[PDB]
Write a protein that binds this DNA or RNA. Sequence first.
RNA 1: GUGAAGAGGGAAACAACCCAGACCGCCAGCUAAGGUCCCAAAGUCAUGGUUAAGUGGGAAACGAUGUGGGAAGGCCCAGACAGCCAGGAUGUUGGCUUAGAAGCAGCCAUCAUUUAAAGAAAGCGUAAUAGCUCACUGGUCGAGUCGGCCUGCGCGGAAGA
RNA 2: CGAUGUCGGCUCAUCACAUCCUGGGGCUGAAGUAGGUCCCAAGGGUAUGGCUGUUCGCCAUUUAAAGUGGUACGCGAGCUGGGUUUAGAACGUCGUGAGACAGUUCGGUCCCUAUCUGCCGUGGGCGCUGGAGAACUGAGGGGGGCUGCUCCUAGUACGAGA
RNA 3: UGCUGAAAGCAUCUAAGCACGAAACUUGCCCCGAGAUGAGUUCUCCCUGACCCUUUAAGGGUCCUGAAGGAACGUUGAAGA
Lengths: 209, 123, 176, 38
Amino acid sequence: MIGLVGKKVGMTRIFTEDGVSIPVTVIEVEANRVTQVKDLANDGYRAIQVTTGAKKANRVTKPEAGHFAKAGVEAGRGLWEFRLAEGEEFTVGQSISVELFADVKKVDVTGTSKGKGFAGTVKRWNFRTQDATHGNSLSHRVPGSIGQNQTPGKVFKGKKMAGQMGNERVTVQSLDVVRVDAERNLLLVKGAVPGATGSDLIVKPAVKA
Amino acid sequence: MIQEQTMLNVADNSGARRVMCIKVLGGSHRRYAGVGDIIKITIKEAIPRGKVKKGDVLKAVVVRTKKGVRRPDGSVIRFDGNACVLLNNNSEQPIGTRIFGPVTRELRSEKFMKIISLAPEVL
Amino acid sequence: SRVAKAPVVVPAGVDVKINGQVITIKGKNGELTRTLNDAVEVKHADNTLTFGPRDGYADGWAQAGTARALLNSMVIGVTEGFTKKLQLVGVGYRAAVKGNVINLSLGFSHPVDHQLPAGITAECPTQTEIVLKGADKQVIGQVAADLRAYRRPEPYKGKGVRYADEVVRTKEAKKK
Amino acid sequence: MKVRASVKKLCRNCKIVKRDGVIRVICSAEPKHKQRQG
RNA sequence: GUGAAGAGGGAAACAACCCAGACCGCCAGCUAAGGUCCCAAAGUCAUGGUUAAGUGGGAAACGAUGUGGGAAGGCCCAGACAGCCAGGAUGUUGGCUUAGAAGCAGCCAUCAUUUAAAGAAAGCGUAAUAGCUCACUGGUCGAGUCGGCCUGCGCGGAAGA
RNA sequence: CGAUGUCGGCUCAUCACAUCCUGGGGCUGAAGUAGGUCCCAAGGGUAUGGCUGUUCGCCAUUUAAAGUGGUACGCGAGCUGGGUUUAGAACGUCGUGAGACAGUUCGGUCCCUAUCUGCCGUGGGCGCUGGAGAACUGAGGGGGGCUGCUCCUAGUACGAGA
RNA sequence: UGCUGAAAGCAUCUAAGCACGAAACUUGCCCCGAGAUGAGUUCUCCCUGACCCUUUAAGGGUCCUGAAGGAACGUUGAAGA
Ligand SMILES: [Mg+2]
Ligand SMILES: [Mg+2]
Ligand SMILES: [Mg+2]
Ligand SMILES: [Mg+2]
Ligand SMILES: [Mg+2]
Ligand SMILES: [Mg+2]
Ligand SMILES: [Mg+2]
Ligand SMILES: [Mg+2]
Ligand SMILES: [Mg+2]
Ligand SMILES: [Mg+2]
Ligand SMILES: [Mg+2]
Ligand SMILES: [Mg+2]
Ligand SMILES: [Mg+2]
Ligand SMILES: [Mg+2]
Ligand SMILES: [Mg+2]
Ligand SMILES: [Mg+2]
Ligand SMILES: [Mg+2]
Ligand SMILES: [Mg+2]
Ligand SMILES: [Mg+2]
Ligand SMILES: [Mg+2]
Ligand SMILES: [Mg+2]
Ligand SMILES: [Mg+2]
Ligand SMILES: [Mg+2]
Ligand SMILES: [Mg+2]
Ligand SMILES: [Zn+2]
């Protein structure tokens, strides 16, 4: 089944009739507008491309605008594809709303995780610190050994080292769908999803059970 | 949130007064026990003519902690100290015959029903 | 070879058909088709099939005997057909057929349902007896072994699914 | 299954058989007699 | 003997092994060891065989109906080998022992009868019997079958960062 | 020998498989539960403490388990500096003595701003054949891969019973 | 672990044929990913003047042109050395 594109609003909670507090991420899902249908004959695969949102004219380049004009829809903040299943079919300029999830029990949510900048091995890879005292010299959060000796005489690819952490694509799987409401452009899912308030989210029905 | 070396008061008439946790049971590298969890203890002080003695090695269930317990609406119940109830090493059933101070409904197990019945108060 | 050199009489009622190595044998009790190994040359004259090796193949005679043996029981198949009987031993062990599915109660939580392949049909004359019938001797054997395997006879009370014929030796437990 | 370098018939119901390049002893009488060269 | 104090070709690389001793020049020719399907110069050469393991391209005692060659031998149309039918008996539960010991815990003996043949019993079985089966023999089948010898090539035995 | 820093720990690891646990299977002198032994299997997982410089080991208590080995007995231009080769001092022992011990004892300086390889991240350039903006396909690469207990089945199969 | 089955009248999981079989393998899940120079595909956007010279060729230069886009500057960010 296709998914949809949305915006992370923030977290809050739903209280239930019998005392449970459900923590929910609030996801804003406005109509997704279909901007190109891809098929086997023309593209080698089946998919819809969608936009959502709105975009500043003066910020819409001409290439971008011709592509939107072709589909018969107004500009949106970006473009995303969702693969089609056999029997799945859509048409250019079609609107897809959040009611798509009305009876989907769980969804996977993809976002761009918050950025933590250049991170040391303690935070990035949960390395353990060496001694704070007992004579340790200048080596508390530093990484330790990064290899063996003459054999192999090199450091291995993949070695866990410090570097950029976050600001990457992350998918969190099988979150409960707590509420769908198209009149308010809302989807509530149970739990935390990746990203900062404001940033784009891809929501798809869960690939697992 | 009890670990090795932690000291606990004792919420029964077993005669123990102060016990130390020498193992958090229930899994490899398991760090903490909380309300409802079983620990291994050594007895550091006991009264003169009770059911157990200083230096005895046994089990106990934790029934009050400072870290507390979370309830499903987000609430917290915290206690001013850590206490446990002594348990037979093998049967893991209570040594004492009376229970002191409040306990929590997290104990409602087949196993700890006797502790909640005896407790003055149940939170 | 002693087996290969022994002709297969094809009786009145059976229709043999050959197209290179692809043999087909039709009778009143179904039709089987087999592709004989290249190294085998088969001939069909009178009311008989005869077999022989083929110039250039190092193992022609061994192959021809297999081919012979097989075609012989293809003919038994579409005439008399084959019958494999099993029986259940153990309390609560029972079986029944509905259509082409054999329902096996064998001391498991879920009962067991075994789909019969094309050509094989089953009947229980008894809650504890399975009669398979078929024209393909390999398939009927494969099935009988599939069923037996849900609960192979065990050595302490002989309990399980067994071939009706089968000999199950039991043994005593380890003394205390 | 006994697995060893030297496999033999241990009784008259033992049979030596080669299966897939591997010498084996199969017995119809005594399961302990069953061997694989290895 | 070679290196040392020796280049050149071969042994992937590799002083010391194989071939061979560089005065200089050549965009001629023959050979040595070693090679000739492509990397890579020269046989996808000819002829007769072997191997089926990628053996070749690591490793022993020992194990095995792998397969090729050779010389002998035993049994067999007076019916062999395999399979299938049937028999496998009497003294007698041999003597001793033992609670029991009957072919089959153990010890000693192992004769004789009726036999087509059938051990005072080859293995399972029973508390001891019973019961299963082998040796052996008649029948059926109908032409081969058995396993030692000299030898070629293979197979397992064969686990390391 | 115009210097290749030694034991142990800490940090970080990587490989083998002669497999500790989990998985599959043959035999069992395997009734069940639980074991023994061998075969297949390297995917992941594989304890904290008391004593001692210890590695190891004994001990306490856990765990499904607390694996065996290679990696300069992995890892000091990464840390420690308790053991152990300096200079102080003492005891026992040896020596007439200076002194000695591979006996013990108290004390006792651990440098290096990374050029190249390598590795973790992140940019600039050019290319992809006029140039440009997006959305993709998915060759290839990496990550992940653990497991306890309880309940139902069922107090059933099995068992004289437990 | 088996089915059918000769070689070897029988037997035999195997020689031909056939059914199963594990946390290993290939997929399935997540991330990177066309510098995948074998540099791929789809949609959209932009550019429509002359001249001279030599060794005349995918030649060199001049005048006029200067798009789409990119970047620059500025206000900046749960993005960042
Ligand atoms: Mg995108
Ligand atoms: Mg940030
Ligand atoms: Mg630490
Ligand atoms: Mg310092
Ligand atoms: Mg410091
Ligand atoms: Mg170093
Ligand atoms: Mg190297
Ligand atoms: Mg196999
Ligand atoms: Mg010299
Ligand atoms: Mg050379
Ligand atoms: Mg000369
Ligand atoms: Mg050539
Ligand atoms: Mg090799
Ligand atoms: Mg005969
Ligand atoms: Mg030097
Ligand atoms: Mg192994
Ligand atoms: Mg052994
Ligand atoms: Mg491992
Ligand atoms: Mg254990
Ligand atoms: Mg070392
Ligand atoms: Mg240093
Ligand atoms: Mg010393
Ligand atoms: Mg592909
Ligand atoms: Mg990309
Ligand atoms: Zn045997």
